[PDB]
Amino acid sequence: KVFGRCELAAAMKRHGLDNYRGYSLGNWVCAAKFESNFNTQATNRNTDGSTDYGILQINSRWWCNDGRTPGSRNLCNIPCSALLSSDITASVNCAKKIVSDGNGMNAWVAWRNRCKGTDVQAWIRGCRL
Ligand SMILES: [Cl-]
Ligand SMILES: [Cl-]
Ligand SMILES: [Cl-]
Ligand SMILES: [Cl-]
Ligand code: NA
Ligand code: NA
Ligand code: NA
Ligand code: NA
Ligand code: NA
Ligand code: NA
Ligand code: NA
Ligand code: NA
């Protein structure tokens, strides 16, 4: 599923991401935008052999099982395929664990390089939430 901007903001809010660990909803939408352009089905292979899945490009190195990432963990206790669903629940629940891991949203390199310090509120501007 490719979400609309406000559509995704609303879903993220309904699943408790808005201000989760102090990160406003706009931070989350911005991260999703640059990670997957709002496409739940987005996958990308990493140089280390791991793969990133879903709207927030969650990495199989630590967070999900895809069966083909040697020496990895599955800390979210889910198949990486669950992260591609039109229903964002699994992505959100896993992202909450990731953002709690110590480095906050810096876990998402794209959030650090493209969202951090910017006017993230622009990402939810105009949305009925
Ligand atoms: Cl957009
Ligand atoms: Cl915001
Ligand atoms: Cl594996
Ligand atoms: Cl933090
Ligand atoms: Na689509
Ligand atoms: Na914070
Ligand atoms: Na993609
Ligand atoms: Na894909
Ligand atoms: Na992989
Ligand atoms: Na994801
Ligand atoms: Na997703
Ligand atoms: Na695994």
Curated annotation (Swiss-Prot):
Q: What further fact does the record state?
A: Lysozyme C is capable of both hydrolysis and transglycosylation; it also shows a slight esterase activity. It acts rapidly on both peptide-substituted and unsubstituted peptidoglycan, and slowly on chitin oligosaccharides.
Cystines in this chain: 6-127, 30-115, 64-80, 76-94
Tell me which UniProt keywords the record has, alphabetically. Answer: Allergen, Antimicrobial, Bacteriolytic enzyme, Disulfide bond, Glycosidase, Hydrolase, Secreted, Signal
Reaction(s) catalyzed by this protein? Hydrolysis of (1->4)-beta-linkages between N-acetylmuramic acid and N-acetyl-D-glucosamine residues in a peptidoglycan and between N-acetyl-D-glucosamine residues in chitodextrins
Q: Name one GO cellular component term.
A: endoplasmic reticulum
Q: What is the lineage of its organism?
A: Eukaryota, Metazoa, Chordata, Craniata, Vertebrata
> What does this protein's UniProt record list under function?
Lysozymes have primarily a bacteriolytic function; those in tissues and body fluids are associated with the monocyte-macrophage system and enhance the activity of immunoagents. Has bacteriolytic activity against M.luteus.
Q: What is this protein called?
A: Lysozyme C
One Gene Ontology term of the biological-process aspect is: cell wall macromolecule catabolic process
Compartments, record wording: Secreted
Report quaternary structure and partners.
Monomer.
Q: Name one Pfam family in it.
A: Lys
Q: Which CDD domains match?
A: LYZ_C (cd16897)
Active-site residue list: 35, 52
Per UniProt, where does substrate bind? 101
The principal location of this protein is secreted
**Species, as recorded:** Gallus gallus (Chicken)
Annotated EC: 3.2.1.17
What family name appears in the similarity comment? Belongs to the glycosyl hydrolase 22 family.
TM region positions: none
Q: Name one GO molecular function term.
A: identical protein binding
Q: Cite the C-type lysozyme domain residue spans from the record.
A: 1-129
SMART domains, per database record? LYZ1 (SM00263)
**UniProt note on tissues of expression:** In the egg white and polymorphonuclear leukocytes.
